[PDB]
Design an enzyme around this catalytic site. Sequence first.
Site, mmCIF file in Angstrom:
data_model
loop_
_atom_site.group_PDB
_atom_site.id
_atom_site.type_symbol
_atom_site.label_atom_id
_atom_site.label_comp_id
_atom_site.label_asym_id
_atom_site.label_seq_id
_atom_site.Cartn_x
_atom_site.Cartn_y
_atom_site.Cartn_z
ATOM 1 N N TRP A 1 -10.203 -8.869 2.686
ATOM 2 C CA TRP A 1 -10.830 -9.290 1.441
ATOM 3 C C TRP A 1 -10.811 -10.813 1.277
ATOM 4 C CZ3 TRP A 1 -7.596 -5.055 1.900
ATOM 5 C CH2 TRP A 1 -8.109 -3.808 1.488
ATOM 6 N N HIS B 1 -5.622 -6.312 -3.434
ATOM 7 C CA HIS B 1 -6.536 -6.434 -2.295
ATOM 8 C C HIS B 1 -6.665 -7.863 -1.738
ATOM 9 C CE1 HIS B 1 -8.640 -2.231 -2.670
ATOM 10 N NE2 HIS B 1 -7.421 -2.168 -2.167
ATOM 11 N N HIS C 1 0.540 4.175 -2.747
ATOM 12 C CA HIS C 1 0.139 5.541 -2.391
ATOM 13 C C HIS C 1 1.201 6.593 -2.678
ATOM 14 C CE1 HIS C 1 -3.761 5.212 0.136
ATOM 15 N NE2 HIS C 1 -3.782 4.382 -0.893
ATOM 16 N N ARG D 1 0.810 -1.210 0.000
ATOM 17 C CA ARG D 1 0.000 0.000 0.000
ATOM 18 C C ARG D 1 0.856 1.278 0.000
ATOM 19 N NH1 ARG D 1 -4.433 3.384 3.060
ATOM 20 N NH2 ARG D 1 -6.033 3.218 1.403
HETATM 21 C C1 HEM Z 1 -10.122 2.317 -6.487
HETATM 22 C C2 HEM Z 1 -8.862 2.129 -6.076
HETATM 23 C C3 HEM Z 1 -8.527 1.773 -4.606
HETATM 24 C C4 HEM Z 1 -9.215 2.115 -3.502
HETATM 25 C C5 HEM Z 1 -10.497 2.964 -3.416
HETATM 26 C C6 HEM Z 1 -8.534 1.565 -2.351
HETATM 27 C C7 HEM Z 1 -8.924 1.700 -1.037
HETATM 28 C C8 HEM Z 1 -8.341 1.056 0.037
HETATM 29 C C9 HEM Z 1 -8.776 1.155 1.419
HETATM 30 C C10 HEM Z 1 -9.963 2.010 1.929
HETATM 31 C C11 HEM Z 1 -7.956 0.385 2.156
HETATM 32 C C12 HEM Z 1 -8.015 0.161 3.677
HETATM 33 C C13 HEM Z 1 -6.991 1.018 4.424
HETATM 34 C C14 HEM Z 1 -7.058 0.624 5.875
HETATM 35 O O1 HEM Z 1 -8.136 0.781 6.516
HETATM 36 O O2 HEM Z 1 -6.035 0.121 6.397
HETATM 37 C C15 HEM Z 1 -6.987 -0.233 1.275
HETATM 38 C C16 HEM Z 1 -5.989 -1.094 1.672
HETATM 39 C C17 HEM Z 1 -5.022 -1.653 0.864
HETATM 40 N N1 HEM Z 1 -4.805 -1.333 -0.475
HETATM 41 FE FE1 HEM Z 1 -6.236 -0.436 -1.699
HETATM 42 N N2 HEM Z 1 -7.424 0.870 -2.801
HETATM 43 C C18 HEM Z 1 -7.389 0.972 -4.174
HETATM 44 C C19 HEM Z 1 -6.417 0.423 -4.983
HETATM 45 C C20 HEM Z 1 -5.271 -0.252 -4.592
HETATM 46 C C21 HEM Z 1 -4.115 -0.560 -5.427
HETATM 47 C C22 HEM Z 1 -3.970 -0.146 -6.910
HETATM 48 C C23 HEM Z 1 -3.223 -1.245 -4.674
HETATM 49 C C24 HEM Z 1 -1.820 -1.783 -5.071
HETATM 50 C C25 HEM Z 1 -1.531 -2.324 -6.263
HETATM 51 C C26 HEM Z 1 -3.800 -1.376 -3.346
HETATM 52 C C27 HEM Z 1 -3.232 -2.009 -2.272
HETATM 53 C C28 HEM Z 1 -3.741 -2.073 -0.997
HETATM 54 C C29 HEM Z 1 -3.214 -2.935 0.037
HETATM 55 C C30 HEM Z 1 -2.052 -3.939 -0.083
HETATM 56 C C31 HEM Z 1 -4.062 -2.662 1.269
HETATM 57 C C32 HEM Z 1 -3.897 -3.344 2.637
HETATM 58 C C33 HEM Z 1 -3.163 -2.386 3.578
HETATM 59 C C34 HEM Z 1 -2.944 -2.996 4.946
HETATM 60 O O3 HEM Z 1 -3.401 -4.149 5.186
HETATM 61 O O4 HEM Z 1 -2.315 -2.313 5.801
HETATM 62 N N3 HEM Z 1 -5.026 -0.754 -3.337
HETATM 63 N N4 HEM Z 1 -7.247 0.208 -0.010
#
Ligand code: HEM
Length: 293
Positions: A190, A174, A51, A47
């Site tokens: 997820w 995800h 970001h 993430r």
């Molecule tokens: C429409 C596009 C996306 C949206 C709206 C989105 C939104 C989110 C949200 C709300 C979280 C939860 C954050 C939290 O509460 O810890 C999250 C986590 C995460 N996102 Fe996405 N995301 C998107 C695309 C992506 C992309 C492109 C990647 C990487 C290729 C990604 C990788 C991750 C990962 C690995 C987590 C887990 C973080 C953790 O467990 O600490 N996301 N995302």
Amino acid sequence: TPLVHVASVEKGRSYEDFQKVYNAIALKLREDDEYDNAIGYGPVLVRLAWHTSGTWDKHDNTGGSYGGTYRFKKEFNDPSNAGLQNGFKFLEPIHKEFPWISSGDLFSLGGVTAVQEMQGPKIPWRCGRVDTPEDTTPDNGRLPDADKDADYVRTFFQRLNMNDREVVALMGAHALGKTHLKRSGYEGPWGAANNVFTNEFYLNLLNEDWKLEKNDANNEQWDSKSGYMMLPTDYSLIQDPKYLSIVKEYANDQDKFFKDFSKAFEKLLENGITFPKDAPSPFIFKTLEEQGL
Ligand code: HEM
């Protein structure tokens, strides 16, 4: 006039230098195993890489991975980045041991290392991002909202020069980690594995029985009886017929998903960077397992 950012190899450094940094990150991933109820730091590092790259704007080449601007207060305090301080803290001792690696190179390498160590595809990676000053930090609000639909997702990703296939592939990240209510206003994983990179995201979207519910932050999310969740933007990938076709493809071809993710993820991490004609080729790092370490 879009800014030009030319990759500049950290002086005298080569593959072996960066493999050492990779190894240090991978060894720390192995060591610090209790973080986030034993998920470990893999997902948060992915993430973080996303970001720090995802602020890019193709129209003027603002934001992007090159400058390593997350080190500045405006960006690390972006509400969209809540929780990423954990990934930053993880990388601090790596930065201390290898002070020669640029911030952008470290943030992006963190993501590559995490994906590979979690049994994901190899992600070719190029060095040469150069730290830029505090006034180059992009404003908050360039990262995507989760409460939106397929049209929003499609339009959003055009700014990052990603097409439908690239978007669906990238979202497969995800499979990793979870949403945390206090960070994002969403709660739950997820899928089951959390720290193993697979095509589980797509399988879950298609195979689970999803119910549209309200979480404890009063936000809508899709929940399954298995205790999994999907964001509205995740679910939009099966609501839109074009996205749906691609979801089915990745759910049924692990290798194809791996290949496409690798390409899209490298592209994400390299957006905005001009690589000179005589720059080194992309590096493909060996995992700890491949090295017998
Ligand atoms: C429409 C596009 C996306 C949206 C709206 C989105 C939104 C989110 C949200 C709300 C979280 C939860 C954050 C939290 O509460 O810890 C999250 C986590 C995460 N996102 Fe996405 N995301 C998107 C695309 C992506 C992309 C492109 C990647 C990487 C290729 C990604 C990788 C991750 C990962 C690995 C987590 C887990 C973080 C953790 O467990 O600490 N996301 N995302």
